[PDB]
Amino acid sequence: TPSDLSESGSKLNVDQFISSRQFEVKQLQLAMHNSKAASSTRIFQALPRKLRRRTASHNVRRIPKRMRNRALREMRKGLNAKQLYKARMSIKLLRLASKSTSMKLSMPPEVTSSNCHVRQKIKTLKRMIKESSTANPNIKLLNNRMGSYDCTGVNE
Amino acid sequence: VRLKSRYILFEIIFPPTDTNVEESVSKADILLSHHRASPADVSIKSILQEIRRSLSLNLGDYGSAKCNSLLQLKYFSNKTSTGIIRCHREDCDLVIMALMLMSKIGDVDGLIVNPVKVSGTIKKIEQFAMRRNSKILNIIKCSQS
Amino acid sequence: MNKDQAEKYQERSLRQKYNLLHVLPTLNSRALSGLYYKNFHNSVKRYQIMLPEQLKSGKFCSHCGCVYVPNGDSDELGGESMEGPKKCIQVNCLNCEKSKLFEW
Amino acid sequence: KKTFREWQYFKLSITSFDQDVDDAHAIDQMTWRQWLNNALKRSYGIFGEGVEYSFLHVDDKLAYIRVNHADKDTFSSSISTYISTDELVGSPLTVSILQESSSLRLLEVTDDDRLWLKKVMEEEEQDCKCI
Amino acid sequence: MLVDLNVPWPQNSYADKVTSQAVNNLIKTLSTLHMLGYTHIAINFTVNHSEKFPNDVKLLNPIDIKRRFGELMDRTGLKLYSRITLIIDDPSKGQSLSKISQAFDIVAALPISEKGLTLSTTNLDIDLLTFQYGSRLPTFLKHKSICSCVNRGVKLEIVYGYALRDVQARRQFVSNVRSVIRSSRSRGIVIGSGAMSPLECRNILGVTSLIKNLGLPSDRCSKAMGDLASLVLLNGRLRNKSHKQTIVTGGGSGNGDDVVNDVQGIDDVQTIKVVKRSMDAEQLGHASKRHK
Amino acid sequence: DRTQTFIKDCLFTKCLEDPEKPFNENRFQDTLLLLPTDESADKQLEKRDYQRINKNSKIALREYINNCKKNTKKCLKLAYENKITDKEDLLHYIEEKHPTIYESLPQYVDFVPMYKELWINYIKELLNITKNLKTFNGSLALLKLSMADYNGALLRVTKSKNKTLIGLQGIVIWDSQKFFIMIVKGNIIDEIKCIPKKGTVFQFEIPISDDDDSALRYSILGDRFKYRSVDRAGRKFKSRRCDDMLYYIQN
RNA sequence: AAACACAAA
RNA sequence: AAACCAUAGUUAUGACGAUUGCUCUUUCCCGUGCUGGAUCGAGUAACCCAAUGGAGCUUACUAUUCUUGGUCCAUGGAUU
RNA sequence: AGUCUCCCACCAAUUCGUAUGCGGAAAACGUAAUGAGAUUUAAAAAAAUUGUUUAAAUCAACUCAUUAAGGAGGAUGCCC
Ligand SMILES: [Mg+2]
Ligand SMILES: [Mg+2]
Numbered sequence A: 001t002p003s004d005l006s007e008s009g010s011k012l013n014v015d016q017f018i019s020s021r022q023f024e025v026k027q028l029q030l031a032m033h034n035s036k037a038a039s040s041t042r043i044f045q046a047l048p049r050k051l052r053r054r055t056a057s058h059n060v061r062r063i064p065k066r067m068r069n070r071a072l073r074e075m076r077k078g079l080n081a082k083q084l085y086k087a088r089m090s091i092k093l094l095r096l097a098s099k100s101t102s103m104k105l106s107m108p109p110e111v112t113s114s115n116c117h118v119r120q121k122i123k124t125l126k127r128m129i130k131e132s133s134t135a136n137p138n139i140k141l142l143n144n145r146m147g148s149y150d151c152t153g154v155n156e
Numbered sequence B: 001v002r003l004k005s006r007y008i009l010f011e012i013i014f015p016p017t018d019t020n021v022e023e024s025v026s027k028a029d030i031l032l033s034h035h036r037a038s039p040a041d042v043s044i045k046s047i048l049q050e051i052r053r054s055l056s057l058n059l060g061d062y063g064s065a066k067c068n069s070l071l072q073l074k075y076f077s078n079k080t081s082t083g084i085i086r087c088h089r090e091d092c093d094l095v096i097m098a099l100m101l102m103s104k105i106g107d108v109d110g111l112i113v114n115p116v117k118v119s120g121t122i123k124k125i126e127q128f129a130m131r132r133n134s135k136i137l138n139i140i141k142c143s144q145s
Numbered sequence C: 001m002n003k004d005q006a007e008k009y010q011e012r013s014l015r016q017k018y019n020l021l022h023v024l025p026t027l028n029s030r031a032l033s034g035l036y037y038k039n040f041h042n043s044v045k046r047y048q049i050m051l052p053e054q055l056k057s058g059k060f061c062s063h064c065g066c067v068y069v070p071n072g073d074s075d076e077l078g079g080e081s082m083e084g085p086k087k088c089i090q091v092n093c094l095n096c097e098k099s100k101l102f103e104w
Numbered sequence D: 001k002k003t004f005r006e007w008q009y010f011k012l013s014i015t016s017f018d019q020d021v022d023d024a025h026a027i028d029q030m031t032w033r034q035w036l037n038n039a040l041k042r043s044y045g046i047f048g049e050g051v052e053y054s055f056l057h058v059d060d061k062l063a064y065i066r067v068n069h070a071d072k073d074t075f076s077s078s079i080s081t082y083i084s085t086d087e088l089v090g091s092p093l094t095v096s097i098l099q100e101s102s103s104l105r106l107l108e109v110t111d112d113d114r115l116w117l118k119k120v121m122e123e124e125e126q127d128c129k130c131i
Numbered sequence E: 001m002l003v004d005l006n007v008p009w010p011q012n013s014y015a016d017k018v019t020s021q022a023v024n025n026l027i028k029t030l031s032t033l034h035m036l037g038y039t040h041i042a043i044n045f046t047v048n049h050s051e052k053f054p055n056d057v058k059l060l061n062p063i064d065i066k067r068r069f070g071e072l073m074d075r076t077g078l079k080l081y082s083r084i085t086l087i088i089d090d091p092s093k094g095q096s097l098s099k100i101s102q103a104f105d106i107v108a109a110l111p112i113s114e115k116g117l118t119l120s121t122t123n124l125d126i127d128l129l130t131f132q133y134g135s136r137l138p139t140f141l142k143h144k145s146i147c148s149c150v151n152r153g154v155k156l157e158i159v160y161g162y163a164l165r166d167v168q169a170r171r172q173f174v175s176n177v178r179s180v181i182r183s184s185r186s187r188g189i190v191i192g193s194g195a196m197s198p199l200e201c202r203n204i205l206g207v208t209s210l211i212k213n214l215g216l217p218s219d220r221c222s223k224a225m226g227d228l229a230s231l232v233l234l235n236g237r238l239r240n241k242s243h244k245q246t247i248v249t250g251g252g253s254g255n256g257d258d259v260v261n262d263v264q265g266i267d268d269v270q271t272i273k274v275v276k277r278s279m280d281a282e283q284l285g286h287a288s289k290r291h292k
Numbered sequence F: 001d002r003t004q005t006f007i008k009d010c011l012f013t014k015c016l017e018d019p020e021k022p023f024n025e026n027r028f029q030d031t032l033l034l035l036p037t038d039e040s041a042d043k044q045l046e047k048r049d050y051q052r053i054n055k056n057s058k059i060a061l062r063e064y065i066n067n068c069k070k071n072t073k074k075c076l077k078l079a080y081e082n083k084i085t086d087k088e089d090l091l092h093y094i095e096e097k098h099p100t101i102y103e104s105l106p107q108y109v110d111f112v113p114m115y116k117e118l119w120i121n122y123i124k125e126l127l128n129i130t131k132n133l134k135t136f137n138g139s140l141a142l143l144k145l146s147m148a149d150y151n152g153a154l155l156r157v158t159k160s161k162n163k164t165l166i167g168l169q170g171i172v173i174w175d176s177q178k179f180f181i182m183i184v185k186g187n188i189i190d191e192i193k194c195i196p197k198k199g200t201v202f203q204f205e206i207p208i209s210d211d212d213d214s215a216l217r218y219s220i221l222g223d224r225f226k227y228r229s230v231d232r233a234g235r236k237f238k239s240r241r242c243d244d245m246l247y248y249i250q251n
Numbered sequence G: 001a002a003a004c005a006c007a008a009a
Numbered sequence H: 001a002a003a004c005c006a007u008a009g010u011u012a013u014g015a016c017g018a019u020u021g022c023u024c025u026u027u028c029c030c031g032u033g034c035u036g037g038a039u040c041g042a043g044u045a046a047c048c049c050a051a052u053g054g055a056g057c058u059u060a061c062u063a064u065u066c067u068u069g070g071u072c073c074a075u076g077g078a079u080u
Numbered sequence I: 001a002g003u004c005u006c007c008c009a010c011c012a013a014u015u016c017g018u019a020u021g022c023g024g025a026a027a028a029c030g031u032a033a034u035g036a037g038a039u040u041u042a043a044a045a046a047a048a049u050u051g052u053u054u055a056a057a058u059c060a061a062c063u064c065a066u067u068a069a070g071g072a073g074g075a076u077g078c079c080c
């Protein structure tokens, strides 16, 4: 077994991993280089600094505190024009806190979307935006699926 | 931080001190008569002891004490008589003056010491030594005609 | 530091704080009264010892920190007055303009 | 910007303990010179031996030494280092630099030898100004 | 002001008994240092680590400043301090600093190994770090360690008085001084003279010339001998006399009653200072108005 | 692992130039970790009323200091206008001609007598000042003084970075964190004195006059008086630099 | 030396 | 088997000489003054040093061991 | 200098589809208005960094909690 299960997770030992697969490495080196396999010099050179990159962190991300507090306010909790944007931001924050891992890690324990009942809130607020009486065919009908229209100003 | 090193390249040249024999006047002839060979009784500890004695004899006590802190012979072979002496950037002048004031080996006489290249790294010293060795071959090939 | 010698130091420091809480100015000046009250309470909080409630309730004020004292050493009275119930019995002070109400 | 200093004076004085051996022997100018020549050769090689120095107003345990401005460091490092041994005294000698000056303005006693040296030094001063 | 903090005492182990000739030579060298000119002299006492410390308090200090230096100061006019250097190489279990530190004034160390150096730089409460300039250096001294040490306290000490012993020791002394000055960044340097006889002593000009020939500028030498010597005396004096820099047992009225300056007034068998009543409550607060 | 190490070395000699570099500097990890990276009511009442009392007493002390600051200036101005030198005439004149500004002025003859005695007795009992003086211990006394309270203490500024702050005596009315508050008296001076502690030296003398007339000479250092314990012990101390005490030796 | 690491200290 | 690339680029960034300017002090003149002018002198700092490039934050510096600007219910002296 | 963070392929989207005080591609990033707080607190005391390492009369400094972009009408205050 090249990998086993242990205290924390799974441990993979390089020793046996390359020990069992040795003749395969020899055949690979013979297929790459034929006459240079007998020689032992420097074939691979240093990576150029232009292609050289830097290493990031092992964590996912850190969410801003403003979005976190707004998501908390939304989760724990005729229409005016501002109440439309309020409900839209409420569904957006719900969806974000549902999908995002950083916000989930910043959320307080014992708080889940099932207990918060996100789906019913989404349905109700979508019914409200549907009641908001918008006019879709006044905006336009596009030609493709990705946003690409023509913005040309004639004599202006 | 960094320790400021300064290597010194020196050559042992033997002047053909023989007034009874007539000599050929040319470039490669005198280059060969001056770069003949080093004697067998030549090593690293025999040159280091000689230069340490000469340093104390010329400069004195404090002049040898300040200079002998990082005075080492890193690379030297008796086949080509090329040596690399490591020292500080402060005491480079002292080591150069001592190599100039080198009189003779305790058993071998009639020789001079020529400091050629001084640098603060061994890679440039090796590159200059290779360039000098390549230059030496040119006059030899030209004179062999 | 010996703990048997530290107990005596604790008692002496508590007595000194309680005496500084008193004499003339903490009765007169509300600033010194409140400051010394805060100091004494910060000193008694560090020693991990509770203080008796019979004194804790009716000892000091809640707005300034002067002792509730009505009219060997003549000093100034602490409180404006102390009425009957009148609807609920209250106590007023001199330094500040507030009163403290208690119900039977 | 700066004037070139010809040399620099040094106030030398012998410190020898053992009052008996001190009053017994009596140093002189040649003694001073031999002590300097031994100190320079003991502490330094030919570098210290080739230092220029002359003797002016030698006295009983007192002397003035002028050293070039370029060799003031070599002189002051060698003087405070060496200790005489079996030169002329039974008790070894130790010297301490009392003071130093670079403007000739120093007066211990009201003698006239400093005045004569000053006179010859300014007749050289105006002479190097003109020449 | 000039301070010399490494005057050696002719005794290394407690089994040794000091003869009268050594005390006479020490009196002579103190007079010699005083005549030409000096301000503060702190004599040194050296013991090793693996020895058995005596389980006493009134016998740890074979200096008795009040007995014979009490005979000498009234005619001399300077002060003396008792200091100890710890020769610690291997971290053995013998460790009784809680007595010798409070009994003495200044506590230094003399490391020979790397582990001893590390423990004396981290945990050991000392005042100066002295190296064996006679022998070879233990290792290649680091920069960050010495900088963090001189920022935390303890500074290095250079003794030019050892170069006057023999000829073969001068090269090693210079080689060690160069490395110490290069690794210490010329910040925490205190200079001393370890002379056993008055004949190996020099003037301040010889000292500054020697150190400027070594590599340290003369103005830095003057500053380190004027302010840094006073500061390293003050630290080692009030760390033992007073508490941990919170309450001082000495009250400076004018310009001479200082905890390091006033040495005969302040009691040593205890720490009290019995002075007559000079502070009342009826006197005017403003000193410009207060008149007697 | 030996033949395995030989294979790894013959593999590293192709990519790297020094094959025994990582094995010497320990960069070839033998293990690869694979794991995702991982009765309260009255108590609250008392806490709130204590917060309120502190917040009120702070403003009260501030405004008291400001009132004293303005009253001293105005009374000294009126005194210079009326040409009256000594205090026994000035205070009586103010009382007989200015009733209001007199209840805002402080009285040193009111502030000294009990304060001085109640602090002297407290310190005498704390430091165990007895008729005989052979039962002392300096270490424990200094520890107690570091732990002792200086609320209502007589201190004299004997040394300071400023040449004008020295020589001022006063009794404590409150112990702040940056400034030190005392009260001084002069010809007409009744100023509340606030003094910085960073770079000043204080001292307090305890009188002892049973048979002989002697007093203890103690002193504190304000610069290092900010990082001490309060009424308790067991606070890990740090060596700061012990370096900015140059004014102590200089003058 | 510098520069690197979910090391090591 | 190379991708090899820096208006410093891989333990390098040296050696002294000369000029102006900056801070104080001992001098003389017009107009008080004027980043007004000229002699007698002292000093040009410390943290500290690149190894692929850029931005943000924090932490070390400037006491005869160069400087500059402002603030202060900080104190000290004087007038109203 | 530092055992700090991030960019140095894209994705009409299981790809932080985040119109959330402003600027910014992002950032353990800069700053603005108000209220409060001190092991009795949301959290400092008995991830990095720093010898001292925020405050605890007032000021100054740190931390946290709110303020979505643009156009139109009315009221108040200033030159007028
Ligand atoms: Mg670096
Ligand atoms: Mg590093």
Ligand SMILES: [Mg+2]
Binding pocket: none
């Ligand atoms: Mg770096």
Ligand SMILES: [Zn+2]
Binding pocket: C061, C062, C063, C064, C065, C093, C095, C096, C097, C098
């Ligand atoms: Zn009240």
